């Protein structure tokens, strides 16, 4: 097991023990499991990160500005936002995505992710 | 010893020498082509579908020289040019 | 033997294949594409 | 008549291998696959009832 | 010995000849998926728990499904779901039933199997390669024109490669058949080479070989299914 | 000398030759698509089933040209064209 | 001449270049497997069983084509085909 | 015998030399090629369109020395220098 | 023209072959190999004790291909099959 | 028989020889260069001409090579060398 | 002729292609290790001490695997099997 | 009674074309891996020109020296073939 | 006919093969270790110094083989073993 940290610029999300993590960085996925080695990437611009517990289902989450940090003791990573897939609701989820801003469109896709309907 | 006798043992070896370059070159080539398709769907999922145009194009390509290798093998073994 | 010749049961397997075929695209697949889309 | 009896022995080791290792985990991904499809019917019928 | 070909219950008819061997193998496997098609027909369980062959049937339905939509629309070409569904079953079947023990001696010293699967014959394997091919060329006619399907896959992806493109076009139905072919010919030989042996240690390379032959079946019908499934497809677009 | 003693030797030595490209493409070709599916599953090890059916399609794909290398030995070695 | 003499001498030299194609194609799979496998336990140690399911099904498939060759070898120099 | 049996046989195993190490050479450079463009379309989706431009040189150049030892079939088995 | 000379000839050079091709697989797939182990030491200086293990499990797979073609090496020169 | 027959399928063997190893050796580098320029133009488009001025010499290089060895075989087909 | 001229020519032939592949193997699986070395002190100055370890073993098994087949090849070239 | 000098002529020629073949693989092959560095190189630091051009050209004047040497012996081969008779 | 003539003709080709073998160690093995030190070079221009020591090892070793293979091409062509 391995310490993730979700971490946003203002406050920090959520911090504790978990058994994989998978996300989407800018080279592409990425699953990262106890004793990876370290690494230093950027998550897409539509990134998801998929928290897999012992015990508790998946906590999925729509990730703005991302960044992911693999060191020898914990997993980090960084948002400019985030949300939880509890506190996502998917009607805004759609108007939010098909816009023209990029950073609107990429949000709505962001948050679709983690709802699961893609 | 008859001309055709040894025309033949040497059409034989040329054969094997051509499909057996052949055969080399398309298993590096399809190795090499199915390995970077690889790479692209584990990293990039949804590229699965996108990815598949260039691929068969390479190995389009690929696969041409060996099956044409092929055919003169046969033109070597089944028609052998020169045979008295 | 060259066993590389075409026979004449080239046919004949292509007619029992077609027979395998007409079995699973009329009395098989259907059921559970159906079986499926109910689920 | 030998290699029927080679090949009656390998078959043999073939069937012992098979449900050694091959039957149960093949036999196991068939219970689960009918255990999530009676769940699913199982909650259909809870939501009609509900 | 090993005597490679050597078809038995050869019997000629119509002036042609047939290799009673490979109908026979062929005819066998057709009543087995027969048997399983009518076993699932019988007991589907639309809402009941469902049995070991309904799950094994929409298991490969699943998967073949899935296959298409993948690289075609599903619904743009349906006939392909059942087409490729028994073409796995029918090859992986032709090769399972090679596992059992029916290779004897004849007194000669060479190995004889009461069943050889019929991919080992020139004829079967050339007979599926040659059915998909037809049947995908006649499906590239109707989703693209008498006229623009030759001109279309002559053309290519790149038309300044019309050359190439011909030669990929016969490579993809021989491609199909002698890839299967070596690969269940070689087994026929491997078997047969093993009988060399005297039991007492023929008993295991026979058996390492016939399990990896297991594979290897299993195997290249999913190859055959999923490359009919993509010839399909290239031959269906714009 | 026999002929066919000369035709058969020339289409072993053919055969020889057929194989030993066959088995080096085929090994080649599996070691690289095999080396694609590794690094694809340790880089995201949950992706493994999604990376076998790409997979498979590459390993057809090279074994083909080996296998149907094998074919064409056995017609250099058990019908040997040419032969007298 | 005993035309058995060059018969064998051919049957010879071909399973010599059969077992010196298959020892190419399982050196080299096996060594790139190898490497895939090193690289992705070094990435991912906690990966190290998962990734073993794929390692030796590659190696599987190398395998078996050199055992194949081996078989064919034998076939060579022990049954020569057309031998006489 | 007569020499034009040997200058046959000769000219048929240099035949075979020359296009299967052409094979060799255009099916592992194409498929070395295709690998780079199948990479770069995964890597830059809008690339794929112009990723051709230099792809096909490369793969123009390889095919070319390709065809150039095709071409030597002509000269070699067809009409074969210093038949005599 | 002894039929055992053309024999002991032709074994010399399947015996030739075998190495000369066991050489190659098992050099490169251990260079390989140890490209592999090399770099993850590189990256991960303490991965060094849980990289021996995959490693040595290649080395065998390679080695093991190149002993066994030893074998069938010292089966050709010394107890050469179909000499008479 | 002819001595000349001996030299001119020596000379084509040895031709073949030459050709194929130019094959082999030009496609191989044409490919490796041409798959390291479709992945820098990949990696950044602007690049395309500021990479042709390398690319050009690297494949310069690897033309040469395989042009010389034409050279040479044009020198032993038909000005074969101790033709007496 | 003398039989011990067909043999020992046989066995010359055999060595070279000992040798041959031996030099094909130890440079080519040489050049990966050190390219893997090379890389890793790049990127690891302080690396060194700890690389050579690792690298050696790499060499360590090339080098047998050429070494052992230039023993073997002065077998063939010093001490004929076979050799009446 | 074939001359002796044929024979000799002839394993002269096979051997010469061996020595070209191997020698044109290897100058072909180090050439392209060369240059794949260089041009990799080049396309991520352009400022590197200059100074990726020392350790190339070394690898370069390695890899064809091989080549030329099999070119010298390839003319002792053919026009001062060993033990020529 | 002269034993001596099938005994230079065989050391002769053998010779061709230990410096076609040589030569393609060498050419793999330096385009590699030179392809690392290239790349080192562009990652980091600091190491211009560093990495030529490793760098020249890995060329001995490859080299060395090379040499080695030359050396004894002498001695098959120049001072034939087993030469009557």
Redesign the interface.
């Known amino acids: 097991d391995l310490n993730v940290e979700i971490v946003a610029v203002e406050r920090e999300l959520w911090s504790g023990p978990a058994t994989f993590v998978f996300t989407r960085t800018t080279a592409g996925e990425i699953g990262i499991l106890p004793r990876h080695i370290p690494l230093v990437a950027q998550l897409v611009d539509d990134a998801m990160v998929r928290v897999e517990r012992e015990g508790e289902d998946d906590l999925r989450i729509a990730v703005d500005g991302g960044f992911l940090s693999v060191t020898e003791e914990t997993v980090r990573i960084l948002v400019e936002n985030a949300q939880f897939e509890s506190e996502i609701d998917a009607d805004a989820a759609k108007e939010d995505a098909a816009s023209d801003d990029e950073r609107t469109a990429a949000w709505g896709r962001a948050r679709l992710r983690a709802l699961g309907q893609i | 010893?008859?001309?055709?006798?040894?025309?033949?043992?040497?059409?034989?070896?040329?054969?094997?020498?051509?499909?057996?370059?052949?055969?080399?070159?398309?298993?590096?080539?399809?190795?090499?082509?199915?390995?970077?398709?690889?790479?692209?769907?584990?990293?990039?999922?949804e590229?699965?579908?996108?990815?598949?145009?260039?691929?068969?194009?390479?190995?389009?390509?690929?696969?041409?020289?060996?099956?044409?290798?092929?055919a003169?093998?046969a033109l070597?073994?089944?028609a052998?040019?020169?045979?008295? | 033997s060259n066993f590389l010749i075409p026979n004449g049961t080239f046919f004949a397997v292509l007619i029992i294949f077609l027979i395998v075929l007409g079995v699973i695209s009329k009395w098989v697949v259907p059921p559970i594409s159906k079986v499926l889309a109910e689920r | 008549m030998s290699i029927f009896i080679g090949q009656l022995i390998g078959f043999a080791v073939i069937a012992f291998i098979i449900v050694k290792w091959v039957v149960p985990p093949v036999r196991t991904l068939m219970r689960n696959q009918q255990e999530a499809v009676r769940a699913a019917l199982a909650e259909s019928a809870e939501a009609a009832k509900k | 010995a090993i005597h490679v070909g050597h078809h038995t219950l050869v019997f000629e008819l119509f002036g042609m000849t047939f290799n009673g061997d490979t109908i026979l193998a062929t005819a066998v496997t057709a009543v087995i998926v027969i048997a399983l098609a009518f076993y699932l027909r019988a007991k589907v369980t639309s809402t009941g728990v469902p049995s070991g062959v309904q799950l094994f049937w929409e298991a490969l339905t699943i998967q073949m499904r899935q296959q298409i939509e993948g690289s075609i629309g599903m619904k743009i070409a349906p006939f392909v779901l059942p087409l490729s569904v028994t073409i796995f079953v029918f090859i992986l079947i032709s090769n399972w039933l090679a596992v059992l023990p029916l290779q004897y001696g004849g007194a000669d010293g060479a190995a004889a199997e009461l069943y050889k699967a019929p991919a080992s014959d020139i004829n079967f394997v050339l007979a599926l390669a040659l059915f998909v091919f037809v049947c995908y060329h006649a499906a590239g006619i109707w989703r693209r024109g008498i006229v623009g399907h030759p001109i279309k896959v002559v053309k290519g992806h790149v038309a300044f490669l019309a050359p190439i493109n011909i030669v990929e076009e016969l490579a993809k139905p021989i491609s199909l058949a002698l890839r299967l072919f070596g690969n269940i010919f070689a087994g026929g030989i491997l078997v047969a080479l093993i009988a060399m042996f005297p039991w007492y240690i023929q008993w295991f390379p026979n058996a390492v070989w016939k399990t990896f032959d297991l594979f290897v079946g299993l195997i290249q019908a999913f190859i055959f299914s999923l490359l009919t499934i993509l010839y399909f497809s290239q031959s269906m677009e714009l």
């Open positions: 010893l008859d001309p055709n006798a040894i025309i033949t043992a040497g059409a034989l070896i040329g054969g094997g020498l051509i499909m057996g370059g052949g055969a080399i070159g398309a298993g590096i080539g399809d190795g090499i082509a199915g390995n970077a398709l690889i790479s692209g769907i584990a990293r990039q999922p590229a699965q579908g996108r990815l598949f145009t260039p691929f068969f194009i390479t190995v389009g390509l690929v696969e041409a020289a060996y099956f044409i290798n092929l003169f093998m070597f073994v089944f052998t040019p020169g045979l008295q």
